[PDB]
Design a protein around this ligand. Sequence first.
Ligand code: HEM
Length: 153
Amino acid sequence: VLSEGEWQLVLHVWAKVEADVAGHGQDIHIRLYKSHPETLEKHDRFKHLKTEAEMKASEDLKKHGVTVLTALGAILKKKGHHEAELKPLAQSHATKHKIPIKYLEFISEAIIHVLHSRHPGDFGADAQGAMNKALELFRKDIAAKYKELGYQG
Ligand code: HEM
């Protein structure tokens, strides 16, 4: 559970993310793929992408990152009351894409890194702590939904 103050900090930085969902998404994916090269293997149309510039140039990847962060943003806005938003996402990621919780930590780390890089003055210790607790909550609940669907990774 987050405090109301923690949610605010979460949603305050999120509003900043929303000034350029596309760019944030690209940075988060590029960081994810470079930090944890095994994650790229989940994406068939993203393996032809060999350099940081090809990634940035890929309209497919850019669109996808907007889809990711839109879905995560909508989750965050519910301040924990996110079962309806989280279920379809558990569903595809558990039974179709097969994304281990470990990979959700990796992208969570990339999110934190990109957030700090782009918004250091709106992402100090408290705001980092809060986004961290939010992503941890997202991860705990999605893991519980993975298990409900029969998926252990
Ligand atoms: C913040 C965490 C994440 C959010 C909110 C998220 C959200 C989404 C959404 C909304 C879609 C499109 C609909 C769907 O299939 O669910 C999607 C597709 C997908 N996601 Fe995730 N995702 C997240 C993490 C990941 C990670 C870490 C991987 C791989 C390491 C991944 C792999 C995929 C793949 C392979 C697809 C289908 C893309 C396609 O082939 O068209 N996702 N993601």
